[PDB]
Structure formats: C-alpha cells, structure tokens
Design a binder for this molecule. Structure first.
Ligand SMILES: Nc1ncnc2c1ncn2[C@@H]1O[C@@H]2COP(=O)(O)O[C@H]2[C@H]1O
Ligand SMILES: Nc1ncnc2c1ncn2[C@@H]1O[C@@H]2COP(=O)(O)O[C@H]2[C@H]1O
Ligand SMILES: Nc1ncnc2c1ncn2[C@@H]1O[C@@H]2COP(=O)(O)O[C@H]2[C@H]1O
Ligand SMILES: Nc1ncnc2c1ncn2[C@@H]1O[C@@H]2COP(=O)(O)O[C@H]2[C@H]1O
Lengths: 474, 474, 474, 474
C-alpha cells in the first residue's frame, strides 16, 4: 500500500522494507480509526457519565463498552529480539495504560450483580487513560500532518491550525463538563446541556459569577481543577490566536524590519532627502516588498531544478535574440545559470565611456540608450545585450549607456563569461562578429577584436549578426 | 491612468498591458468607493436594524436599498477563455455572495404588500455577506497599502496600524451592537446608543456584570456569540498593541542583543575590566548604537546607487586633497568604492614601524601622529593618507603612526590598491612622487620607489606632491 | 571530588586548582542543602507565622530556630588578599543579610521573658531575608542546571521548566498565604488551609469576589501588595506557559517560515503550478521537514568528530564497492569528508552527454540509468559511482545519466577530486583502469585516459575493476 | 562643557561645532530640569485639581503658576536661515503647544476678579499640553539613555527598564486619579488618597466591582476613558514585564535553540546513541553553553583591538615556550592573530601517521601523547606545538598524536604558516632546527628538512631548540 512508500519516503526503501518484513500499513489505518473513536469517547465520557444518573444498559453504554474493548485490543496489539522489545514496551507504558483501561462498566455491572454507586462510578474516571491514549494520538496526528506535508496546499495559511483550535475548544468543553459535574457530585436535557456549554464559554471568557463557598473539601478541589483547566484553555487559545496573528503580520514585518535596518544605515550616514527617496524607490522597484535570498534559494536547490528555474525565468530572452535560439541547449543553459539579476532606475549610467568594464548586461525589461560622441543616440529594447566589446577586447568601454526607463537586466561577470566562452569556442566567434559589426556601426576602431575574429557555422554567425544589428538599429 | 503604471510597476509593462487590453483602473477606484460604502453599511446594519423597530420607508432605508443595489451591481461586474473563467469565478464564490446579497428589504416589502416581522428581519442578517465582501476589502486594502508602499513616509512608524486598530475598534463596536440586540430580541435614542457603546467598552475591558440567566436557548446562544466576539476583540487589540510596542522596543533590543552576544564572548574568554571597557567604548564609538550590515546593504544595492552613496560619504575626502580633485571621475569613484571603514581609538598604534603592511588609510575624521627615530613627530590632520610607501615598495613600514584622538579612517586593501593602480597607471607615478617627497622629508631610503618613479602631467603631479607635503607639514 | 572537575570543566584544570588550594566542593553541597532548607522555611513562614497564633515553643518552632541558626552559620561562612575580599563582601551584601537574618524568635522570647505581640511577630517578616537568600538560590540552581547541562536527556523538552513553574506555583501560594494573613491582621485547620489555597487559586484565575472596603490603611496596603503579587504570579505563569508552547510551535514554524520564504520567491518569479509542485516535492523529499545547516554544523565541529560522522553516514557506500574496502583508511576518510549531499527526483537528467562536467557522483540511495546512442540502457544501483570519465579526461561527457527513482547521491567536486587524487596517486590508476573498462564496455574511445592508465597493486586494481564492471553490468 | 563632546561623539567634531557656534549644552540641562518639573506637575495636576475644591491662592498653586511660567519660557526659547526655521517650527508644533500652555490659573483668577467654576476648572485640563511636552521628554530621555549608553554597567540587565515601568505605574496612577475625578464631577485627605490609589490598583488588576449606571452622558464617557486608559496600563505593564522575562529566558533559549537544530540534524542522519552523546559532550565542552560567533566578533573589531584580545588569550602560550619570548613582537602578534581555536576529547586522534597534514597545533590546555613505532610514547604538555615537520617538509606525517585528556589547542593553517614564515625568514630556520632535533629524537629521516636547515642568532636558535627538546622530553 501507499503507507510503506509514505513511511520510507521513496519506493526503493519501501521495497526493501517490504522484503525485510516478508523475510521475517493497514494496522496504521486501524489505529487511526481507533484513535478517532477513543477521542470521541473521551470527549463524551465527562458529558455522558456525569450527566447520566446510571448506565442502565443503554445502547450508548453498549457502544462505550465496545469502544473500551477496542481500546483493550489496541493495547494488546501494541504489546505484541521481539520478546525483549515487547517486554520493555510493556514495562514502560503499556502495562500502566492497560491497567488503567480496565472495563470499569463491566466491573461495576459484576459488582452490582454480585454512596457506593458514586464510588463505583468514580472508577469511570479511568477515561484519563483514554486521554493519555489521546495524547499519543495528538503526537500521531502531528506525524500525520507531517505525512500530509501542508495538505499539498497552503492556500489560507495553516488550515490544520483550525483543527488544533477546534480541539482546544473541545478540551475547554471538557472543562465545562467537569464544571457541570462538580455540583452534580456536590448535590430539559438539551436545555441543561446548552446551559452548561454557555457556562463553559463564560468561564473561558472570565465574565464573572457569584459562585463560591464549596463547603465540601472535594467540592473545593473540584472548583480548583476547574479553574486551572479553564486557565489552560485560555492560555492555549490566546497562544494559538497570537501565533496566527503574528505570522500574518510577520508576512510583511520581515520586509519592514529589513527596510528599517536600511533606514538606520541611511540615518547613520546622513544621506540627503533626495538620495533617501531614490534608495527607497529602488528598494520598492526591486524587491517589490517581498523577502527572499535568491542566492541562498538557488544554492539550496539541486542542479536540474535551478537549471529549469533559470531557463524559465529568461524564456523570452532566449527566444528573442537569435544567438541563443541557434545555439545548443548546453551552452545556453550554462550561460543562463551564470546570469545575475539587477534593476536600474532611469537616469542611472550603467556603463560610462572610458571606464574599465567587468560584466555584460542582457536586457529583459525596459530600454537602454547608447550614446557617444558624434554618433548620436540609439536605443536597445527588450532582448538585447551590451558590454560585449569590453569583455572580448579586455579594454576600456567605447560608448556610454544610460537607462531612460525602469529597466531589469541580467549581468554576466567577466570570470563566468570567459569560462563559458572558453568551454564553448564557437560563441566566441559569434560574439566577435556581432561586436565587430556593432562597433563598425558606432564608428570607432578595434584592432584586437578584428584580429581575433579573423562553412555553415560562419553563415549562421553572419545571419545572427545581421539579425542583432537589425534589432539594435532601432 | 496611473493605475496601469502602479499595477505593472513600470511604464514599459503598463504600455504593453494597455496595448493588450486594446487588442482584446477606473473600475478599481469604483470598487474602492463601493467597498468603503459597503464597510459603512455593514457597520451600520447591526446598529440600524436592531435599534430601529421597522424600516418604515425611511430615507436611510432608501440609502441602504441603494447600497444593496450597488453591491449587487458590483457582484454582477465581478461575474462578468473569458466564458470559462467567468463560470469558474461564479461557481467558486460569486454565486454564493450574490445569493446572500439578495434584496432583503425589497423582499420584506413585497411580502408585507402581498413574530413574522422578526423572522423577516432575520433575513437582514444577510449583512454577513457584506461582511464577507469586507473581508475581500481588507485583503484589497492590504494590496493598497502595498501600493502606498509606506505612504512614502514612515515618520511615526506604521500609521496604517492606527487604521487597523480603528477597524478593530469598529468590529468591537459591532460586537457591542450585537450585545445590545440580544435583549432586544429577548424582549433618548442618543442616551441608549451611548449606553450601548459604554457596555461594549466594558465588555472589551471585562469589568464584570451580574447579567445571567438568558432563559431562552436563542438568548443563551446570542450571549455565547457575544462573548466569543468580545474575546476576539480583546485578542486582536492586545496583539496589535503588543506588536506596536515591540517594534519600538526591538529598535533598541536588536543592538542590545548583539552587544549581549559580544558580552557573552567577552566573559567566555575572561578579559580584564579595562579591556572590557575599551571594547565597549569602541563599540559605542563605531556603531553609535545602531544595527546594520554595511557590506550586505551595499551589496544588495545596484552599482550606480552604491557608487553615489560612496561618492557622497567621501565628499570631503575627495575635495580636500588635490590628488583626487585633479583625477578623472572614473578612478576616483572606483577607488572610493573599494574603501572600507575603520575607527581607531586614541593610543592605538595603527601602523608599527618594521611590520609588513597590507592596507592604506585615508583620514576622514581626526588626526594621527607619525613618529619615528631622530625625526621628531609630525601630525596628519583630516583629509590625508598614510601607508602608500609600503604599498608601492612592497616592503616593511618605515615610520610608526599613532592615533591621538578618536579617528575615523577608510582603509584600502593591498589587492584593491594594486588592481586600481594597475588599471590606472598615472596615479602610480602620482603616488610615487608624493611618497618619494614624503620619505625624503622623513629621511629614510626608498631606492626601489625612487627607481620606479624615475609634460603637463608631470607638472600636475609635482603640484599635487607640493600641496600634499604642505598639508602634511603641520 | 567531582565538584572540582565540574567547576574547572576538565581534569587538567581541576588538578591545578586542587594544587593551588593545597598550596594556599563539599561546602557547595552543604550550601545546596541549606538553600533547600531555607526555601522550605521561606515557603512555610507565611503559612506558619500567620496561621499560628503563637510559637508556644512548638517542635516546628524549634525546627525553625535551627534553620535560622543554620542560615546564620551559612552567612558567617560566606563572610569568611583574603581580608580585603572578605571585608568587601561583608560591606556589599553580607552585612545586610546577616542583620536581616537576626533570630527574631529568640529576640521575641527574650523580650517576653524580660498589640505588642503583633508588633513583635512583625519582626518575623524578616523571612524576606530568607527570600533574598532564595533569590541567590535560584541563581545558584540556574548555575546547577548549567552543571546538569540538559540533565543529559532532553527527552520531553525542558523538564527543568516544570520545576520552574512549580516554583512559580509555590510563589503564588505564598501570595495566597499573604492574602489569608491580611484579614488575620485586620481581625478545622485543614479546612481553613484548603479554603485559603482555593482562594489563592481563584485570585490567580481572577474569578472575582465582592471583597472590598479594607477600612484600615494597613489593610488597604495589604490588599494592594496581594493584588500586585497575584499580578506577578499571573504574568510569570502566562510567560512560562507561552514560552513552552512556542518552543514546540517553533519546532515546525522554522521550517514553515523557510518554505514561506521559498513561496514568496516562487510567487515573485511567477512559476507555473507544475514547477511549484515539483519544487515543493523536492523540498519535502530532501529536508524531510527539518531545519539545519549541514555546512554550518559540520564546520563548527572539530576534525575527528566530522570525520567519524561522515564515515558513519557513508558506511554502506564504503562497504559496498571494493575500491573503498581495499583502500587505506586515510584516503577513504578524506574523500568521504569532501563529499556533498544531493537528491534527484525521477526524470531529472543528472548528466547530459556533450556537457562539460565539474563533479562526479556516488549513489547511496536509488538507481540511475545510463543511456546513450546504440548501446541501449543500463542501470547503476546503490553503491556505485558515475562521472569519473570526465573528471579524469577533463573533457566532455560521454553518456547521459537519468534518475528514474527518487535518488540520494553524494557528489565530489572537480577541485576536491583532483586534490585528493594528487595526494594519493594509486587511486588515480585505480579509477583509470575502472573507467577504461567502463568506456570500452560503452563503445566509445578515450585516448587520453588510456595513455594515462598506461605487481600486487596491479592485480588488486584489476580485481576491483572486474568487481565494479560486474556490479554495473546490471 | 562635556555636552558638546557627548553630542558630537568626539573632541575633533566638538571643537569644530564650538568654532562654528562662535562664528555665528547648559540649555540642554535647563531643559532637562524643566522636563522633570513638567513631568511632576503633569502627575500632580489630575491629583491636585480634582482633589482640591479650589486653588484658593495656595502656596502649591503659586508653585504650579511658576511651573506654568517656566513651561511658557521653555516654549518661547524653543520658538527662538534662522527666521525661516523658527517660523516653520512655530507653525509645526510650537504654536499649538504654546496656545495649549495658556495660564489657565491666571485666566481663571482674572475672570473671577472681573457651575461656572467647574467650566473654568475644565480649562485646567490643559495639562494635556504638559503631557505632550512629557512625550517630547520621554523621547528626550530615550536620547539621554543613548547618551548614558548602558549606564556604563549592565550589571542587572536593563535598569532603565525599572524607570520605564515606574513611569508606567505613574501613568496608571494618573488613570486612577481620573477614575477618582469621575464621581467628583458626577457629584481624611490621606485616607481618601490611599483609597483612590487602592481603587487604581484594583482597576489595574481587574478585580471587579459593582459600579455601573453612570446616568450622566459625561459620566459615561468618563468611565469609558477610565476603562481604556486602564487597558493601556495593563497592556504596557504586561508588555514590559514579558520583555524583561524573555530577555533572561532567551539568554539560554538561544543556545537551546542552536542545540535543538543540532539535534534535528543528528536525528535526520540517525546517528547511534554513543555518537550523539559524544557530540553533546563536545558541544558542552567547547561552547560551555554560550552563544557567540568568534569569527564574526573578531571580524567586526578593528585591528588593534583584535590584536590585543588575541595577544591576551595566548599570554601563557607566548610566555611558555622560549621561541615566542625571544621573537620580536610583530611576528608573535601576527602568528597569534592567525591562530584558530579547537578542542579535542580524549581518545581522538588529532594527527594520524601517514596522512597528509594541513595545519599545526599549539597546546594551550591539556596534554597530548605522541606515539609511533619502536620509539615508545612521549607526552607533550601545555605550551608546546606539534605538526611543524609536515608543514616544513610538505610531506606525510611521521608520528601519530592522540589526545588523552580534554585538550584545548590552537591550530595554524598551512597557508597562514607559509605566509607568516615567508614574511619572517628567521623563524623558518628556528622551526627547522627544532624539528630536526625532534625528528632525530624520534628516529626517522628528514633529509629535505635537514638540507633546508643547512652568530648570535644561531646561538639563540640553538638555545631555543634545546629548551623545546627539554620541554617535549617530559
Ligand atoms: N553602434 C552600436 N550599435 C550597437 N551596439 C553598440 C554600438 N555602440 C556601442 N554599442 C554597445 O554598447 C556597449 C557599451 O560598452 P562596450 O564598449 O563594452 O560595448 C558596447 C556595445 O555592446
Ligand atoms: N616625513 C613624512 N612626511 C609625510 N608622511 C610620512 C613621513 N614619514 C612617514 N610618513 C607616512 O607614514 C607612513 C607609515 O607607514 P608607511 O611607511 O607604509 O608609509 C608612511 C607614509 O605614508
Ligand atoms: N558502459 C558503461 N559502463 C559503466 N559506466 C558507464 C558506461 N558508460 C558510461 N558510464 C558512466 O556514465 C558516466 C556519464 O558521464 P561521464 O562520461 O563523465 O562518465 C560516465 C561513466 O561513469
Ligand atoms: N621525538 C619527538 N619529539 C618531539 N616531537 C615529536 C617527536 N616525534 C614527532 N613529534 C611531533 O609529532 C608530530 C606529528 O606530526 P608531524 O610529523 O607533522 O610533526 C611531528 C612533531 O611535531
């Protein structure tokens, strides 16, 4: 079944576990059903035994007896190299739970057949054993919520938290049932049940009442346990509600804290108002108000996943310029995997003429204008690259580039560019032809690039150069 | 309109979205107005229907009917490739909201025209549909608060949090309105309204009262919902107030925690009291009691922003000594971008004669005294550099330097200095001339530097050397 | 004794401390016993003095007098280079504590022997001095909990937290004792004690009561201190309960926050549903829902511990293929220490033919299929390595590798592989022989590897190659 | 005065600020005194105006009038390039505060000289202006607590937090004063004041009372503000108390969380019980249960501070073996600065014979035994180094070393050792002589080291070698 694969985590380990079991599950599902039944019975017991004057061989009493027998069978199954482990498990918790899971109803029936009634019904408080089984069961459903990782959809945050607070409300209803039982031991059924539920809600809300003077010491202790259990109800409710609220607020509070650290730095260095506003604008236009570590996220993923994420992010980039389209997938995906993300505001000079360059930019969003002396301006739209001339020649920049609209680029470092272009020689001549044509259009001269640039591959490179020149001619 | 640019985040994407829409906003503003009106109506409904005995065709009843018609029109617009999406949206939430947004007032009027009054007015509880629309609306105003990034000014922390706690107070007033309606269903207008508001405030404050014995099961349930909604009011109020308080608390608590980690380290290594106080003094004199990661902050900004921040920080540095003023902007901005920040206390020996040097220091605040044998002392004030002789010669230091006042310097590493000076050869001879003059003033020997240092550029270098010697002569 | 070793942290420092003491513990155990006795006496004093009308030379009064004498002896011992330190300690806290630890019972007995009774018994409020000693004692048991690092077993989280909340309950019982004493000063023993305990529990639970009008100013102040001490009881209880709850909550909340950051990244880049599901599947199949930093954890451990952890993790890996079994332990443990962990889903192509490789993989879980042209498919099961051909030849990959089941691999980088193989030359010939046989089986040609690969060691290498070919023949 | 240095942060900036002021403090101290007086007056006003039937030209009324005049003078001083700034400051907050700081007592006296009494005394509610000045003052004392950085001693955590909670208690007393004033407007002095304080405390602890039916709308609003201000008192008290508690809790919770992450890793890899216990023992013996990042802490300190910290940590190390004592301070401090800290349990093999070594160990705590074939064992105590032979010869290790007691070592990497020993050639021959003598004692061959090792400096090296051999012989 799927239980073996879920427990092992993979088919290969599940097959080995099955083979080992055969050489030497459904029981888990039966245990889950028994745990649900035991939780229901443990909820009903304070509301059933206290409310009912006597069992009177009721059909619900028969159902409770059947549930107790099922719990005893579950304990026996849990009790069952193997002998020593079974003995240790029995001596650890199983013996105590089995003794505390004695058939109190059957014992009372036998005693009656063979004040005293209240003492006998006090043995029905052995539902605390079912509550201990329910603590094992909440551990189990924690394991199951691990199995249902996030129910495969965290559409509205923790939805299992709704079940947790529902269980807390059920425990608080148990507290109210005990509070109702206290005067029952001290001294219309639907109306009484609703009144008890309302009293439980009021106690959880600490509305206030004039009840006091328990007189009986046992009654005083009963009110003491009622008060402390109501306190635990309040504490659990407030803790879970505050946890949810703090998670919902933290969703933005993480970014708010990071930007508050940024603001602290800006206030230390005392930047002018305009510079502060520009930094704020860049932060909002880059992170969009979200929190992540792109380097860390892509580092902690394996190679194929990072490869496919990067190939998806720049799909329009690889589709737009023909140089990537004609190229083989290996080089394309390597060059993609070595790209980094940057965003430039209008007016920022990405590359200044006469500077020493260290990276190449691919435009994915926006348009950037190349300007230089005596050659007028010309703009590079989406899906085009600039900075190849300095990278190939290893010299000073020839023309300046300026962002005139909010633009999103990917930058390729000099080391990564040289490494990739060395492990794929053909794209070196491709970029050389493109850069020679581009620089001839610009009007400058480049002897080293022409010397370096000096068949079907040649025709493909010429076509790519023509297409790139036509696209950049805008 | 500006809505397209705000949604797309840039003009380039906004234009593409507009072109796509034309090939195939104001509605957003109308939806915002309708959401505000619906929030007002949902606030008024518990206070209006419960308080008023009957609608009686009042002008406010006409306004409520108009608001219901507007909500129905909004639902119809939300309902309206496109057919399948519209059908899915209708089957998901739109159909249920539209059914729950039925004209209860019109239906009641038709029934009256064609105990029963209370049952008919119970259909006005369909304002829960308007409350669901208001949940969509708080999601929308979360989106809008993202649009108004931080209202462009976080002068007094989260100011939107004030609106959030005001909305929480409005919800708690809704709870009080329900609490007032409970005895109205069970069994001077301004005075009654104020009394109800005071009762709501008291319930939120859990002052306490003798109210009990709802008798009616519906009345008991009404008090139950009143209690739980008051509990949610309390939880939301305490959560938001605590978050607000802890923001300001954490503003200083982050630095306190970092320094407590420092103190834990300092206690682990068991440093003396004087060294403990010296470390504390350095921490207070460097970080000024603020938390940031200068390396991380400057790393996560793009190149022009980091360039302008660094060029602003060292403005007095670049302006003060003529070597930077005469130089071209590219070299100046690069070498500034490679500087690091270090603060030295008085008495600390920055550079000891005979040691092997690895960095060069530019003084931005304070004065440091150069001392060595037989040449007396001489002091370097703001805007001057020391450490060039070792960097150029690649040998041992020639004179010792000692901070005599709390000083703030920027240090340039050996690798960065060699890289920058290699990509800009002219400043190599500039620093060589300056260092040769300085060492001739000191009286040591720099034969390697003299050999390395051995037109208009020469005259400019000589003038820079003379100015640097005159400034350092103090 | 073990106290010296526990305080010093090692036997070497303990011996030096013992030698220094001899040249110039059990007292710690006696101080612990005295602190326990003082805590018991400080708990009993509000419940004993207030409840009892007079001491009447009771046996418990004799026990209290003996405890006071023991406390005085402890103070004297604490009072006792050494003279100056003792004087400073006496002038700091010891003198005040000793004065406040005066024998109030003996003084009262002497005064009686030589309204006034209440004034004399007010001197018994000097149990606040024992409470100050108990504050020193809670500091001491914090030190002891550091000595019992985590009791050597954190089986059920902080178990010392149970003792802390028990002490908080004891303090709240002290508050209730003061609340009982308030009307005793203003104006069946077991029943009264239980009633007082119930009143204390109710005050901690803020149930509410009609008690008011203290009339006496001292009575009003007594109720004021009772209220504020109940406030501290409530605050401490809620704080410790919330910390306990949030520990277990954070155990899963840390992973949930990391995956929420991943989800924010995924929502920013707008990946399709299938890609989001694949990323979620990889995250759940790699981290298993746990939080750690394998690099950080293995970095902050010393070399032998990391060595043994890594040697344990790959025990089946080293045992399975004979190449590691025949090898000397040094090379095996080094190459294991340089392995990294990766996990590949089915369908993912680990190595594509024609790509440039930078790492080679060892399979520890799952099976991966080698496929290439004209040679059909063949599957590599657990305990086998692929990718050595590219590493040795320093060329393009020869065959493609595809994961067909969820597989867990360790990868060895190119730099680490070359460094290890250079510091151990024999395994280079071993891998060369194995890879030459493997590539001959594949059907391609490798001249460089054959030239590089061109005694008992040779026979062992041939046997290892035959075994590896037989294992990979599946 | 010291105010200029405190504000500027250094003497150099303070002198420049003083020169600029002279070209164009005590006022700060006067403002502090005025703020303290205004806080006292704002505390007294709810307790003075409400309690007193009329001013009656009392001496305390004269004092209040003087305080109001002082506040007016402070506002005038705050009001006083400079004209525009003063006008902007006046139009921002100063005008409103000055108008609200009108002499209400003088105005009432003039009106009386020239029901109505209550209306006139309602103008004394202008103490809200003093409360706004007190908010400016709490901002100011936040600045002052930044000036008193941690009061120069965080002996018992945040002691300023005690003042903060005292101010919160004062605000809650203000709330109680308003609560007392509410029935005073609706309808033995020490007894009444104590009763009001007790009522304020009871409201703070929400004990509960039968007060209700305000009748008057103004009375109902008064109880409403009283309730909300009491709620703010409760929220501030619980927030500050929880922050205080969680500081001490987090002091150990941070280490507990790090070790819980370690335990999660250990459970993920499923290490045996003995290995888990060994890892726990190493963690407790290395970190001693403390949280820090030695690399980060030493990285964020400047060079002289790190130099002195490291020179202090290894004081016994540098003093013990004579090689460091004879050496010049520069080399000693550099090689100390490049040391790292490690700790080895007994039984761990630090260096195994036949392995390739990459670091050298200096013993600072404990003893490690060198063992090898045919040469028996011999032990290296505190203050001695091993690993020099492999570092100098760049070959395999010659003998194995084993920790037999919990030992603390400093390790010096191969790159750092080669760098330091290259920049200081003399210690190369020193270590060569020592290692040659040591290996001759061992009985192996070091022909390369002997060739490499082949005046006063020679005599010093020989003496150092003899002393090192004598120390190692033990
Ligand atoms: N005339 C042109 N046509 C197309 N691209 C150009 C032209 N002139 C300059 N560029 C690009 O602009 C870049 C600016 O920096 P580089 O000189 O490194 O490389 C340059 C080319 O990539
Ligand atoms: N006579 C001098 N005039 C100016 N600067 C000096 C003089 N002597 C030394 N210095 C500076 O002090 C520095 C000390 O270290 P360096 O030798 O690396 O480089 C030295 C110069 O920068
Ligand atoms: N016939 C074969 N038998 C065993 N292993 C192979 C065979 N063909 C390819 N491989 C392995 O598959 C790997 C794929 O990448 P490499 O060429 O780097 O190295 C290859 C070998 O490790
Ligand atoms: N006879 C000896 N006397 C002192 N030290 C030794 C002796 N033999 C080995 N050692 C030390 O033990 C170290 C073990 O590793 P290395 O060979 O790198 O360097 C060795 C020396 O530092």
């Amino acid at each position: 079944n799927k239980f073996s694969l879920r427990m092992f985590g993979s088919q290969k380990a599940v097959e080995k576990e099955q083979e080992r079991v055969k050489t030497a599950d459904f029981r888990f599902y039966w245990d889950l059903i028994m745990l649900i039944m035991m939780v229901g019975n443990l909820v009903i017991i304070p509301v059933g035994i206290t409310f009912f004057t006597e069992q009177t061989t009721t059909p619900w009493i028969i159902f409770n007896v059947a549930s107790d027998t099922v719990c005893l069978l579950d304990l026996i199954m849990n009790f069952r190299d193997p002998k020593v482990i079974k003995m240790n498990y029995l001596k650890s918790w199983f013996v105590v739970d089995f003794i505390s899971s004695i058939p109190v109803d059957y014992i009372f029936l036998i005693v009656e057949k063979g004040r005293a009634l209240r003492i006998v019904r006090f043995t029905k408080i052995l539902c605390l054993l079912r509550l201990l089984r329910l603590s094992r069961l909440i551990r189990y459903i924690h394991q199951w919520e691990e199995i249902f990782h996030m129910t495969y959809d965290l559409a509205s945050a923790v939805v299992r938290i709704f079940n947790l607070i529902g269980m807390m409300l059920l425990l608080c209803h148990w507290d109210g049932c005990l509070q109702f039982l206290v005067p029952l031991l001290q001294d219309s059924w639907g109306k009484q049940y609703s009144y008890a539920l309302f009293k439980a809600m009021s106690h959880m809300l600490c509305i206030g009442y004039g009840a006091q003077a328990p007189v009986s010491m046992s009654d005083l202790w009963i009110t003491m346990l009622s008060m402390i259990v109501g306190a635990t109800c309040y504490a659990m409710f407030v803790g879970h509600a505050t946890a949810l609220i703090q998670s919902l607020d933290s969703s933005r509070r993480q970014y708010q804290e990071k930007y508050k650290q940024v603001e602290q730095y800006m206030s230390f260095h005392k930047l002018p108002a305009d510079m502060r506003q520009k930094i704020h604008d860049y932060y909002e236009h880059r992170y969009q108000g979200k929190i992540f570590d792109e380097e860390n996220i892509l580092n902690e993923l394996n190679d194929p996943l990072r490869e496919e994420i990067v190939n998806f992010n720049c799909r329009k980039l690889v589709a737009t310029m023909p140089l990537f389209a004609n190229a083989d997938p290996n080089f394309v995906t390597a060059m993609l995997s070595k790209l980094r993300f940057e965003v430039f505001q209008p007016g920022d000079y990405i590359i200044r003429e006469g500077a020493v360059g260290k990276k190449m930019y691919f435009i994915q969003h926006g348009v950037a204008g190349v300007i230089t002396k005596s050659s007028k301006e010309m703009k590079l739209t989406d899906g085009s690259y600039f900075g190849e001339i300095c990278l190939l020649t290893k010299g000073r920049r020839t023309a300046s580039v300026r962002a005139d609209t909010y633009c999103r680029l990917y930058s390729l470092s000099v080391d990564n560019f040289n490494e990739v272009l060395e492990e794929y020689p053909m794209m070196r001549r491709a970029f050389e032809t493109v850069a020679i044509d581009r620089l001839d259009r610009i009007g400058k001269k480049n002897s080293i690039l022409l010397q370096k640039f000096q068949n079907q591959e040649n025709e493909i490179l010429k076509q790519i150069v023509k297409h790139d020149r036509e696209m950049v001619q805008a």
